[PDB]
């Protein structure tokens, strides 16, 4: 549904304007969750091959955690860039066309009528 | 102690006991034995506890709330001030329930205190109770289990509209 936005620079995972955003920290909770997913994948790999789960393949578990945290960081960067594009386009089209978005006069409660239905 | 105006009590009138028989009443000796055996040690214990209290005194205060514009001076779907109005309305609801509790306690105390003359000596208490429950029913009744300040405002507007058609149909 953004078929006309990325067409000027196709096949770009992370464009240049994505560097204008604040990058996510290394202590992001989603990033730590993806690292936990990598640790769980290492545990499952140790369990399905009939190995000691918490001892064997420590380098394997570290590689799993590292690869998962790397791909999670890059995917989080792409997600943040996409949502920045989304709300930037929202605000831009709202600003460009204020005839279809009139300013509603928010009336107070002193004169508006709310129907009351008693409970008994 | 309590404030005398919020919980009034008429002054007591205890008769003098006039003896007419030669048999001594044992209740006077029972009260004297009770005061000799029970009143003095309990009073001494309470005096010691009061001394221990007066050694170390500290204060606690009653919380107060200032006035915010109510639900009728709030824009619709504007949360940051109408939330305060709803908050104050719920606090007023709790205080008003306590006021009704005070009036009920006054009525029951009047009835028990006057005893067999409750039909004549507690007209004021029953009149004030009837007034306060009529106003309470006109304010908070039939709101429902999910009551809010908007519902009470709508009920008040409906009541004033009924009053307006009442004076229009009477003129």
Tokens of A8: 């000027």
DSSP for residue B74: S
Rounded distance, CA B8 to CA A4, Å? 81
Give B117's contacts (C-beta < 8 A, 6+ positions apart). none
| Helix-helix angle B79-114:B123-140, to 10 degrees | 160
Contact B151, A116 (CB under 8 A): yes
Residue B84 CA to its chain's centroid (Å): 26
Rounded distance, CA A71 to CA A41, Å? 14
How far, in Å, are A63, A65, A70 from residue A60 at the CA level? Answer: 5, 9, 15
Tokens of B27: 């209740």
Where are the domains positioned within chain A? 1-97
**Residue given tokens 């107070």 in the structure block:** A108
Q: Is B144 left (phi over 0), alpha (psi -120 to 50) or beta?
A: left
Runs of H (alpha helix) within chain B: 26-34, 40-55, 79-114, 118-121, 123-140, 149-169
Rounded distance, CA A14 to CA A18, Å? 6
Beta bridge partners of B75: A108
Chain A residue closest in CA terms to B82: A109
| SS3 assignment, position B75 | strand
DSSP for residue B11: P
Q: How far apart are the first and last CA of chain A?
A: 51
Name the interface residues of A facing B (CB cutoff 8 Å). Answer: 106-110, 112-116, 118-120
Residue B145 in contact with partner chain A when CB distance is under 8 A:
yes
Contact B88, B68 (CB under 8 A): yes
Q: Which of B135, B111, B113 is nearest to B125 (CA)?
A: B111
DSSP for residue B135: H
Most B CBs within 10 A among A103, A116, A118, hence the mutation to make, goes to A116
Contact B79, B91 (CB under 8 A): no
Contact B159, B138 (CB under 8 A): yes
How far, in Å, are A16, A89, B26 from residue A4 at the CA level? Answer: 18, 12, 107
Rounded distance, CA B124 to CA B135, Å? 17
| SS3 assignment, position A108 | strand
Neighbours of A104 (CB within 10 A): 8
How far, in Å, are A97, B7, B99 from residue B133 at the CA level? Answer: 57, 19, 11
CA distance A112 to chain B (A): 9
**Backbone phi and psi for residue A2, each to the nearest 5 degrees, phi listed first:** -115, 40
How far, in Å, are A110, A119, B166, B167 from residue A116 at the CA level? Answer: 15, 10, 19, 21
Residues in chain A: 120
Chain B residue closest in CA terms to A118: B142
**Backbone phi and psi for residue B45, each to the nearest 5 degrees, phi listed first:** -65, -45
Positive or negative: CA dihedral B76, B77, B83, B89: positive
**Backbone phi and psi for residue B41, each to the nearest 5 degrees, phi listed first:** -70, -35
């Amino acid at each position: 549904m953004m078929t006309g936005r990325q067409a000027r620079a196709p096949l770009q995972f992370l464009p240049d304007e994505a560097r204008s955003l604040p990058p996510p920290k290394l202590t992001d909770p989603r990033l730590a969750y993806i690292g936990f997913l990598g640790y769980c994948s290492g545990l499952i790999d140790n369990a399905i091959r009939r190995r000691p789960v918490l001892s064997a393949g420590l380098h394997r578990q570290f590689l799993y955690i590292t690869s998962f945290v790397f791909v999670g960081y890059y995917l989080l960067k792409r997600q943040d860039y996409m949502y920045a594009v989304r709300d930037h386009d929202m605000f831009s089209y709202i600003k460009s066309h204020p005839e279809d978005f009139p300013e509603k006069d928010k009336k107070t409660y002193r004169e508006v009528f709310e129907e009351f239905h008693p409970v008994r | 102690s309590w404030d005398k105006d919020v919980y009034p009590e008429p002054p007591r009138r205890t008769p003098a006991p006039s003896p007419q028989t030669s048999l001594p009443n044992p209740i006077t000796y029972l009260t004297k034995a009770f005061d000799l055996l029970v009143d003095r040690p309990v009073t001494l214990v309470r005096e010691f506890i009061e001394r221990q209290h007066a050694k170390n005194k500290y204060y606690y205060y009653h919380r107060e709330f200032r006035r915010v514009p109510d639900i009728t001076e709030c824009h619709e779907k504007d949360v940051l001030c109408m939330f305060e109005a709803e908050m104050q309305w719920k606090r007023d609801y709790k205080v008003d329930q306590e006021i009704v509790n005070i009036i009920q306690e006054r009525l029951k105390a009047c009835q028990q205190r006057e005893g067999e003359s409750h039909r004549q000596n507690c007209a004021k208490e029953l009149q004030q109770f009837t007034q306060v429950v009529k106003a309470y029913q006109d304010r908070y009744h039939d709101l429902g289990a999910h009551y809010s300040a908007r519902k009470c405002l709508a009920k008040q507007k409906q009541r004033m509209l009924a009053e307006r058609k009442a004076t229009k149909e009477a003129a």
